[PDB]
Amino acid sequence: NHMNVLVIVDEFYDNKYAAPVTDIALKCGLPTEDFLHPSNYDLLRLELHPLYDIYIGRDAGERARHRAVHRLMVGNLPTPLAPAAFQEARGQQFETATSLAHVVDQAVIETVQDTAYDTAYPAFFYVVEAMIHGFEEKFVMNVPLVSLCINTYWERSGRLAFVNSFSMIKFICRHLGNNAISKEAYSMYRKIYGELIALEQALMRLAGSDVVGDESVGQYVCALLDPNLLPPVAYTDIFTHLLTVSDRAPQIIIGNEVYADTLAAPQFIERVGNMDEMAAQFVALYGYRVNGDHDHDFRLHLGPYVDEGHADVLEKIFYYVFLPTCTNAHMCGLGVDFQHVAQTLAYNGPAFSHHFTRDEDILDNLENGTLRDLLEISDLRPTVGMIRDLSASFMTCPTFTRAVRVSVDNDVTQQLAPNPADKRTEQTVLVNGLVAFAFSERTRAVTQCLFHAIPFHMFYGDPRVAATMHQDVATFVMRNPQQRAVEAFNRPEQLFAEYREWHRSPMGKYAAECLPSLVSISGMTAMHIKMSPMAYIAQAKL
Amino acid sequence: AVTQCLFHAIPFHMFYGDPRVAATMHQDVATFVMRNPQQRAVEAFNRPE
Amino acid sequence: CINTYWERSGRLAFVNSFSMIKFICRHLGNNAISKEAYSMYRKIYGELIALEQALMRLAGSDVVGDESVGQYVCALLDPNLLPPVAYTDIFTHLLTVS
Amino acid sequence: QLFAEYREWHRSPMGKYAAECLPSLVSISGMTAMHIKMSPMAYIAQAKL
Amino acid sequence: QQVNDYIKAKVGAQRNGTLLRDPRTYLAGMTNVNGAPGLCHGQQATCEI
Amino acid sequence: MARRLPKPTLQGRLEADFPDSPLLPKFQELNQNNLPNDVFREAQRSYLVFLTSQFCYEEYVQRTFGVPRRQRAIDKR
Amino acid sequence: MARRLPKPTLQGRLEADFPDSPLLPKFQELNQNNLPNDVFREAQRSYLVFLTSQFCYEEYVQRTFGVPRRQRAIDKR
Amino acid sequence: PALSASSRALIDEFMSVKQTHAPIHYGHYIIEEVAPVRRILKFGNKVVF
Amino acid sequence: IVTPVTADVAYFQKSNSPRGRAACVVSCENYNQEVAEGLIYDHSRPDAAYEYRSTVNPWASQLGSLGDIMYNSSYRQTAVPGLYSPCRAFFNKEELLRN
Amino acid sequence: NLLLAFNLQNALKVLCHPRLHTPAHTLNSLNAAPAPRDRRETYSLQHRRP
Numbered sequence A: 001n002h003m004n005v006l007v008i009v010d011e012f013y014d015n016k017y018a019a020p021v022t023d024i025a026l027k028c029g030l031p032t033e034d035f036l037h038p039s040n041y042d043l044l045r046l047e048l049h050p051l052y053d054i055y056i057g058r059d060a061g062e063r064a065r066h067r068a069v070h071r072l073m074v075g076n077l078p079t080p081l082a083p084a085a086f087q088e089a090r091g092q093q094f095e096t097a098t099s100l101a102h103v104v105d106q107a108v109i110e111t112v113q114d115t116a117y118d119t120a121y122p123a124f125f126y127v128v129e130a131m132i133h134g135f136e137e138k139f140v141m142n143v144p145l146v147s148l149c150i151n152t153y154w155e156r157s158g159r160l161a162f163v164n165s166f167s168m169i170k171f172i173c174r175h176l177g178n179n180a181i182s183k184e185a186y187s188m189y190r191k192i193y194g195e196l197i198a199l200e201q202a203l204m205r206l207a208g209s210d211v212v213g214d215e216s217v218g219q220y221v222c223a224l225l226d227p228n229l230l231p232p233v234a235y236t237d238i239f240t241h242l243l244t245v246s247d248r249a250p251q252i253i254i255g256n257e258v259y260a261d262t263l264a265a266p267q268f269i270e271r272v273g274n275m276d277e278m279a280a281q282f283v284a285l286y287g288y289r290v291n292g293d294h295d296h297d298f299r300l301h302l303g304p305y306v307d308e309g310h311a312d313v314l315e316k317i318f319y320y321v322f323l324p325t326c327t328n329a330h331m332c333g334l335g336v337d338f339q340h341v342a343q344t345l346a347y348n349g350p351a352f353s354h355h356f357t358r359d360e361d362i363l364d365n366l367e368n369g370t371l372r373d374l375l376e377i378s379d380l381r382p383t384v385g386m387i388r389d390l391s392a393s394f395m396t397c398p399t400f401t402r403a404v405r406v407s408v409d410n411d412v413t414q415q416l417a418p419n420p421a422d423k424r425t426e427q428t429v430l431v432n433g434l435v436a437f438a439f440s441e442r443t444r445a446v447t448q449c450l451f452h453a454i455p456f457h458m459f460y461g462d463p464r465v466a467a468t469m470h471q472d473v474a475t476f477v478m479r480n481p482q483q484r485a486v487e488a489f490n491r492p493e494q495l496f497a498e499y500r501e502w503h504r505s506p507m508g509k510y511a512a513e514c515l516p517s518l519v520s521i522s523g524m525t526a527m528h529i530k531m532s533p534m535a536y537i538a539q540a541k542l
Numbered sequence B: 001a002v003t004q005c006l007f008h009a010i011p012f013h014m015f016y017g018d019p020r021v022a023a024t025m026h027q028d029v030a031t032f033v034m035r036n037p038q039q040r041a042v043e044a045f046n047r048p049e
Numbered sequence C: 001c002i003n004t005y006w007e008r009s010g011r012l013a014f015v016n017s018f019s020m021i022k023f024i025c026r027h028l029g030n031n032a033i034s035k036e037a038y039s040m041y042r043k044i045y046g047e048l049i050a051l052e053q054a055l056m057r058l059a060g061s062d063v064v065g066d067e068s069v070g071q072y073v074c075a076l077l078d079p080n081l082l083p084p085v086a087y088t089d090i091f092t093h094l095l096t097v098s
Numbered sequence D: 001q002l003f004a005e006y007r008e009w010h011r012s013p014m015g016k017y018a019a020e021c022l023p024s025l026v027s028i029s030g031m032t033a034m035h036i037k038m039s040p041m042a043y044i045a046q047a048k049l
Numbered sequence E: 001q002q003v004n005d006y007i008k009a010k011v012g013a014q015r016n017g018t019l020l021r022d023p024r025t026y027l028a029g030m031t032n033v034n035g036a037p038g039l040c041h042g043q044q045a046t047c048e049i
Numbered sequence F, G: 001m002a003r004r005l006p007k008p009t010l011q012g013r014l015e016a017d018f019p020d021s022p023l024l025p026k027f028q029e030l031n032q033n034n035l036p037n038d039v040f041r042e043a044q045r046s047y048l049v050f051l052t053s054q055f056c057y058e059e060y061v062q063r064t065f066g067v068p069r070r071q072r073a074i075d076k077r
Numbered sequence H: 001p002a003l004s005a006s007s008r009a010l011i012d013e014f015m016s017v018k019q020t021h022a023p024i025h026y027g028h029y030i031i032e033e034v035a036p037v038r039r040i041l042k043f044g045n046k047v048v049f
Numbered sequence I: 001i002v003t004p005v006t007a008d009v010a011y012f013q014k015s016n017s018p019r020g021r022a023a024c025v026v027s028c029e030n031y032n033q034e035v036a037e038g039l040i041y042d043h044s045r046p047d048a049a050y051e052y053r054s055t056v057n058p059w060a061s062q063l064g065s066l067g068d069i070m071y072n073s074s075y076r077q078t079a080v081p082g083l084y085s086p087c088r089a090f091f092n093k094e095e096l097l098r099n
Numbered sequence J: 001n002l003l004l005a006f007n008l009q010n011a012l013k014v015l016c017h018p019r020l021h022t023p024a025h026t027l028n029s030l031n032a033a034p035a036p037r038d039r040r041e042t043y044s045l046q047h048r049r050p
Helices: A005-013 A023-027 A042-046 A086-099 A106-115 A125-132 A138-142 A143-156 A166-174 A183-206 A237-247 A262-268 A279-293 A313-324 A340-348 A369-380 A384-395 A463-469 A469-480 A507-512 A518-526 A533-541 B019-024 B027-035 C002-008 C019-027 C036-059 C091-097 D012-020 D024-033 D040-048 E002-011 F023-027 F037-063 F069-074 G023-027 G037-064 G068-074 H008-016 I035-039 I066-071 I093-098 J007-017 J024-032
Strands: A054-055 A067-070 A249-251 A269-272 A300-301 A332-338 A402-409 A424-429 A434-436 A451-454
Touching: A005 A402, A005 A469, A023 A042, A023 A507, A086 A183, A086 A507, A086 A518, A106 A313, A106 A518, A106 C019, A125 A143, A125 A166, A125 A340, A125 A369, A138 A143, A138 A166, A143 A183, A143 A384, A143 G023, A166 A313, A183 A313, A183 A518, A237 A249, A237 A262, A237 A402, A262 A269, A279 A384, A279 F037, A279 G037, A313 A518, A332 A463, A340 A369, A340 A384, A340 F023, A340 F037, A384 F037, A424 F037, A451 A463, A451 I035, A463 A469, A507 A518, C002 C036, C019 C036, C019 F069, C036 D024, D012 D024, D040 E002, D040 J007, F023 F037, G023 G037, I035 I093
Parallel strands: A269 A300
Antiparallel strands: A054 A067, A249 A402, A332 A434, A332 A451, A402 A424
């Protein structure tokens, strides 16, 4: 009922004890030799079909009745009946069929991977990322700041910054290329963007020119091309755009009430202007924080949707294939208390004083404060003018983070089922929050107020990362060290349900043990085919 | 955007009439391409007769 | 200490003790130390994680009672085994949980 | 008073191995596997893998 | 008593043990065999380790 | 509903006592009718951040105009 | 029986001879009643070390504060 | 079982040397058919009974 | 018959049941169905053929698996009895008990 | 003519039993038997607390 994610995340791990584990989590942990031995019959008895995952409910109210939920992709198959080496070998079959040529070099992957493992990764670049939140206008006001960020982080150590979100990776590629950042660092960014584009030709190439109706059949072959799947991190209003183009009924749950009607757009969703028009409303928005109740809001603030045009495939490819491969799926969902952040930048002593010149070293005059401490550990020294450009974005920046859950029916090829809720696949989307590499212990001293940990996705929920971010989680994993694996991890029911998700536990397991090398990149891609009667037809030709 | 005042697309040859290039140059070719994703294969792209 | 010993001879200091190896990773991530010498302490500490995660695959997902079986599988995972050097009160933490 | 070899966790052959082992990564894992407890709980786990 | 039941269940000694003890065995002192409904190859030759 | 992240550590009453600025007079309009002074101080701290953003946003827009060419005519002549 | 390592090399009577410093009044309060010469000298050495460490810790604590914004503004004036 | 092979190459060796042909390659397999009727396979003009 | 990719090749070089278990009922008692059924369908015990494995593919042996649904005369009722089924003999539960 | 694998999982039925994991019987035969070896382990048997 309460929109607040702080209460949702805290109360789930607050005082925790024995934590159960799902069955699909257990089946992926046993080898074929062990799976078939008649000492694992409990696991074996349930399984009778390749496509449909089946579970037994509680005995409440009646004799429990079995429920079958379709496994959307090949990668959802149990490991003891499809080992990782098989999907890796099957994926290498996909590269040679569609004539895919990888733009990325292995040197860049290790460069991306090495950033994912740094506790030394600075927390200031983490703050900048949040205040832009994917707006071209907001980003351009701070290009002189971010160029300092990449410049000093790439030259201090040969590992690049701002790879956490796809939006920043996109603008840095589009912008700052000519001289803002060092040439060695910039070419790394191009290849990552380039790699996504190369893959898109492959998946597109796999689907035959031919179409069922007016629409193309790429929607039925691959999960990635299928637009009803959404990227976890949303900063623009994708949902309303989702309701227009979806043939399958689309239901959006916003807290207690979910609206599946386009006409409902005014009440649930709001718009954020280009910061030229909202100028008149600058004062109106501020009073909404102080005298407005943010709990029980049941509204969602997002910029107006912009049609980049690749069907949003490129962002999904980045989040579901590239990042979990290079970082071994070590990343977490993170939300921000924005007004707590601006109070650090604006209520700073030096920024406030008129006498201080626009160009100066802030750390010379910074008073003991959270901002000073953050800078020392991030070891980056910015001018006085830069902070004011960040403080500028306070007028637009959203109040609080929110999680949003989507409900979408399967294709007609996958809809035959006895139960109405079984035809309907679920997914969770983070609004106005960014993903997270591991935090340093020193980092989580003054940064604790600013950010908290949310386990939005299997790829993006990790006990390794979550424990650092949240104290409750760390004492949870400590008392039950078995939980350290991603499949065995427990997420609040309000946020994650392993059965009704596009990425099941078996897929998650592959990424964690999956190698950093490029061969695996094609592995995750080929794992995304749908196992549908028209998926077989596409596969047969190649 | 900067070159909008100065340059416009023309897909006229099999090698040249390229969808990735065309979408960037032309807004309407782009939005046509968004509706039908496959067209981006250079063999099947649709140039003006 | 570290910046001088690394450049005067191709070796790294304080590798004697774990606590120091831990601190130098959390702090000093700033350039304070030379760049090339820092990654050594990082890899020394990074390896300790991959060796523990690998042991978490040896012990399965199952549990005897409340506790995990990992205690019974490897000696390192046994909470009754203690490091040779104690600087804080690990002994009462041993009495409560054992 | 400091050391009684029989009533220890790490007996003599653990020392004999480290004294002669080469520094390479092969010896890193080789030391790790030498810690498995030789119990029925260990045999069940080693069988599965 | 907990670890003894974990072992006896991960090894299989209740549905695939040979002797099949139930109250007839301990209370009344009989020694019955397991089912083995069918035999494909013939008499089972026990292997001792 | 439950709680909020903890407040960041900042020096008390830094904005008014430490510095004198036009923003200070424009801020005096805010009053504390009902709140506890503890709360009032916290409430007061939030307002100036808003004021600074307005001041810094406007200073940014002035740079966005560019260089006046009419000006480049007179002095450079 | 008890035992300690041998004492390190130290120039005897550092305080009484070399400097004149604020620590002398606090040190001079230690007086020897029925103590031999070497034991009294060792006690004096240890007590001077203690006082020096006290002073150094207090210095560090006072240094750890930082710069006040009021004085920064007054200087920028 | 019926005679079957995963690749043309495996079959090519089976005909040439029946006795020494390897049943399983690194990635390919071949099954020799076993049945009451022994049919005569005459690929090329090399006969394998 | 749909089969896990990983099923051992050694199972396909010998004459065996196309399901994951052998189904001979001759070994079982002449006049008892439940124990006769226990050979065909019970996976708490390994099949007679191979002791170390309960079943090569669980998508055919199991009572309700994909193999069972497609070829049992029970469910295959709507289908017109026009054409011969090679797999009918091996999956049709009624025929297996006749022996 | 069936090939069969005899791996560790097959031998757990005898390898997990507590007959394997007890020293009671080995010590029983040794102490009942006549005089044992005449050499002797004096050093490092047990901790001596100071």
